């Protein structure tokens, strides 16, 4: 089926190149503005009890705007916060800030607003030492994203208050820096990865245009990918991890596909074949493998769509778009470019690249100046290594199997959590600011559980109903009691001007003694029998996080079942055998287990955390669901890449041992190069202030290391020999 497309693309090489390069450039230009139309509210399962409770609370009593941005004020020259001159100056500055921006900021409320008020809650807003204070500045906006945009707009003028001695913390600053880490990571990649991947390509292909064709495609892929995501942003909301996911996964896999296609074309040319025959054979043999690998990634990433998390759905869209576009490019535009170039693809150097490139795209300047700066043995090595491995297959498989099984032990200690300030390095400015806020003013940052009571009849809720609901709530123990009195716990939520005072809805709330035990208390609050005609929901940040974790756990078995079944069926269709898919699934599962074990060993147990200056905190719910699919898809990708040559060798009429040796020897350098490229682009994101990005990048590069050294150098050939001729049992 691919022979027809090879003939067509050779026949219409110029037209396809022009059409698809124009499409990719247009998509990249469209996606340039993807940062403005990207949301950050996909971290929780939708349509659950907790989210329904939060929505009802927001609708009735309005949003809690007091914790948007909190500004800590420290008087200069060790002056007391009660100084009249300092108070007057800071009040005037804050009033000027508020009046300058009447849209971004609702206002500022705090002790400085009324220093003479005898309100214990407000009086607690200033430290006992009278050396610090803080103010709350609610922001306008009916959506979290719009509030974040307002905060970003008003931040530069807000930081100048008190002569710069102001510490902005809370929710909005944390979200702003969490989003800014994405830009920091993208810039770090743009600066560091491209020169190193270019150097790797130079090593694979020596100072030739073939060394640049893959990277170009990579660029185009992500460019076009971004456009698609921008388009997807007009249909459904997307999360701010779509951009990093594209720039990492799509870039790496697109460069890998381009490397494989170019290597196959060069091999065909060296063997002796017309450019038309060369392109036809590299799209039938290597192009088919690339397409099947992309389809395997798509089938391994779609099961993430089952999870209700919008973050997982957005990353699934990003992965699908990037992979599909990378495969489409590698087959059509890369093949047509190779057809146009002809045998001189490996002869000429940077000539056509410098003739007339497209300014301001992928930093092509980077690669071209990198080549400017940088003005068979592998086959034999691989053959001898695999021959030695096959000479003693069991002796090499057993130690690897046992060590990988051992690496899975720490996964038993995995713990899951939610968003927090711990997702930034300990030296981060606003993380330290919020920690100082908590230390100076403990108890002002709370995440209480909320009981939302609603009447189906619409009648106002009687006092007796709230009274006995509070009593039954006290029946459950394990809630904060700072005042040590049951009479005045489970207080009603503060009522803001925004929202409608619906008498049929009443929300009470109270903090939890320990967050870890929340999972039980939630259930104890839900199993609690509500009044006759009142429906009750349990909400709040602990409730949302626990519900997301529970939904992820509930859907994980089905997700894994679908993942295994789809990947095995796809490999059966591709290879045509029945047992190779089984062994590939087993190898992917083992690699995933080892990677998750190592990730839990370092990130959770805090082993090696000092090197990358991140605090050890439990993982977050959707991250494990995402990393499982990513690792499985990538390990299956490399398994298919390694086994495509073996299956082609067997179809060429040679023994199983000879076929596997030939395949591994031929694909050794290509696999090593692809692994190096993806490891480099992942390491570009490893040194990231976002601990979620650290999670994903470390997991990906650990999968790279395992599947590139242990799985393939020693383990896979041994297992193939042990299976013997039964590998082709179909």
From Swiss-Prot:
Compositionally biased residues, Basic and acidic residues: 485-504
GO biological process, one term: cell wall organization
GO molecular function annotation: cardiolipin binding; diacylglycerol binding; phosphatidylethanolamine binding; phosphatidylethanolamine transfer activity; phosphatidylglycerol binding; phosphatidylinositol binding; trehalose transmembrane transporter activity
Binding site for SQ109: 637
Site (Part of the proton transportation network) residue list: 583, 639
Cytoplasmic topology ranges: 2-14, 262-290, 339-393, 581-583, 644-670
A GO cellular component entry from the record: plasma membrane
Outcome of swapping residue 194 to R: Binds to ICA38 with a dissociation constant (Kd) value similar to wild-type
Residues reported in the UniProt entry to bind a 1,2-diacylglycero-3-phosphoethanolamine: 40-44
Effect of residue 697 to T: Binds to SQ109 with a dissociation constant (Kd) value similar to wild-type
Subcellular location: Cell inner membrane; Cell septum; Cell tip
Periplasmic side: 36-196, 239-240, 312-317, 415-559, 605-622, 692-695
Outcome after substituting residue 588 to I: Confers resistance to ICA38
Keywords: Cell inner membrane, Cell membrane, Cell wall biogenesis/degradation, Lipid transport, Membrane, Transmembrane, Transmembrane helix, Transport
Extra information: Binds antitubercular compounds N-(4,4-dimethylcyclohexyl)-4,6-difluoro-1H-indole-2-carboxamide (NITD-349) and 1-((2,3-dihydrobenzo[b][1,4]dioxin-6-yl) methyl)-6',7'-dihydrospiro[piperidine-4,4'-thieno[3,2-c]pyran] (SPIRO) with Kd values of 0.05 uM and 0.8 uM, respectively.
Family assignment from sequence similarity: Belongs to the resistance-nodulation-cell division (RND) (TC 2.A.6) family. MmpL subfamily.
Protein name: Trehalose monomycolate exporter MmpL3
Whole-protein residues included: 2 to 738 of 1013
